[PDB]
């Protein structure tokens, strides 16, 4: 209905300039990205017949 629309914006170069404790500011970290590397494991199930 156009009421609530969708955006992406930048970071005011006043805020970005001092980010994570510059010029006396605090409590404002940068955002970070890591990675993970977790593993999977399978097992071999058997099977068989007779006559």
């Amino acid at each position: 209905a156009g009421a609530l629309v969708e955006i992406a914006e930048g970071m005011a170069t006043s805020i970005a300039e001092l980010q994570e404790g510059f010029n006396g500011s605090t409590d404002n970290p940068w955002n970070e990205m890591g990675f993970r590397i977790d593993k999977q494991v399978i097992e071999a199930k058997s099977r068989q017949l007779k006559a």
């Binding site: 001092l18 980010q19 510059f22």
Partner: protein, 51 residues
């Protein structure tokens, strides 16, 4: 008399001194030890250079 100005003079005055031929005969000694060793760095929280 060598008449030096004092360009910042909070009232007014003239201070009649003595400076001998030697640097030993002075009345006050300004002895430099190290000089303006420049230092640099960057705070890794905010990355922005301090000097």
């Amino acid at each position: 008399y060598r008449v030096y100005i004092d360009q910042y003079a909070k009232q007014d005055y003239f201070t009649v001194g003595y400076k001998g031929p030697n640097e030993m005969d002075a009345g006050i000694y300004y002895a430099p030890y190290v000089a303006l060793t420049p230092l640099r760095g960057s705070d890794p929280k905010n990355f922005q250079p301090v000097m």
